[PDB]
Amino acid sequence: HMASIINITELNISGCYLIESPIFSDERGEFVKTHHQEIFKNFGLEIPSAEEYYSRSKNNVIRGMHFQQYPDDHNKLVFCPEGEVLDVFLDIRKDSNTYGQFMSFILNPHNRRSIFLAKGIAHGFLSMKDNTLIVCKTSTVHSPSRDSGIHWNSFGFKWPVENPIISDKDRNLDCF
Amino acid sequence: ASIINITELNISGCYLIESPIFSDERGEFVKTHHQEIFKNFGLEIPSAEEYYSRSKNNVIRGMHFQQYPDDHNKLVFCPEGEVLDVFLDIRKDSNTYGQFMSFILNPHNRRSIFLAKGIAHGFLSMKDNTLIVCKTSTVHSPSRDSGIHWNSFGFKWPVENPIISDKDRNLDCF
Ligand SMILES: Nc1ccnc(=O)[nH]1
Predict the structure, then answer these.
(1) Phi and psi of B67, rounded to 5°?
(2) What is the Cα–Cα distance from B2 to A147, expressed in whole angstroms?
(3) Atom 4 of ligand 1 has which residue's CA nearest to it?
(4) Which of A87, A136, A52, A59 is nearest to B25 (CA)?
(5) Which residue of A has its CA nearest to B35?
(6) Which of A108, A163, B135, B144 could join B46 in a cystine, given CB atoms 3.0 to 4.6 angstroms apart?
(7) CATH class of A1-176
(8) What cellular component terms from Gene Ontology apply here (chain A) (predicted)?
(9) Ligand 1, atom 2: nearest CA belongs to which residue?
(10) What residue segments make up the domains of chain A, in order of their start?
């Protein structure tokens, strides 16, 4: 595998992917390639392009676990170009072979990882540093009527933190 | 104030995008794109390629564009650090051919720049660890990848001894 291009690994949870971005470095700093449509298309993927936002999280924030319900369900693509997260996702697709399973990955500017998540995946993260940036794209726009979630502490994960900072909204999500 | 504002700029087909910010005890989130709001102005998010650069203080990168038929729209924001983003209209049938504009982008102003095909784009980094996230509507095409020399179009860069690649140092003058 050539370290000059974007490399994509489909994960045990089908429809989710680790994306490993290359880097070019010189006296000016760095350039990192995060998406290329031809590369993505081999995996049957298109970049989510309905909405984008970025979050800036204090240390020990947990945000999640979030997803949008059919028929406004969407693919989601995240990377962390500053700070660090432990990114966590749970397969909540009832008819999935990995239903109720989860995976997690540390994302940061050092490893240059992105995660692509299919529809029906619940997504969250733990900010492990102040000023942690997560840039996030979704394949359908935010749907207040279908926006949903599962409680961060309700699906078997062992979060390496004490007294995480968590929204009231996130605190009142239903248990998986 | 609470939603994405898009304003057309003097150089036509180019737009200033001003993102809203929402805050709580956890931090902030900033909406950079929504397809419907973009569509309200005739735009679509460039989505063939994305990359981000991280630049030391006093770096200049540019001026870059891709040539027809692989010319592309370009969208940039700065979520960390600061840049003076600069662009040149190089479209010969344009009423603003040869004119340029410049805009400070940073995470406080939350400004993004959308650029039309046929615009040469570059920036000057004003802070270490400056992040630019860039999207293009066609993928990189090395055969059509081209440029105009940063010091060749009238601009007074507010920097002494900028740090510039060999490539960029030897682009054709405008
Ligand atoms: N994919 C790329 C985009 C822009 N510049 C590059 O060198 N490569």
Answers:
(1) -85, 145
(2) 20
(3) B140
(4) A59
(5) A50
(6) B135
(7) mainly beta
(8) cytosol
(9) B140
(10) 1-176
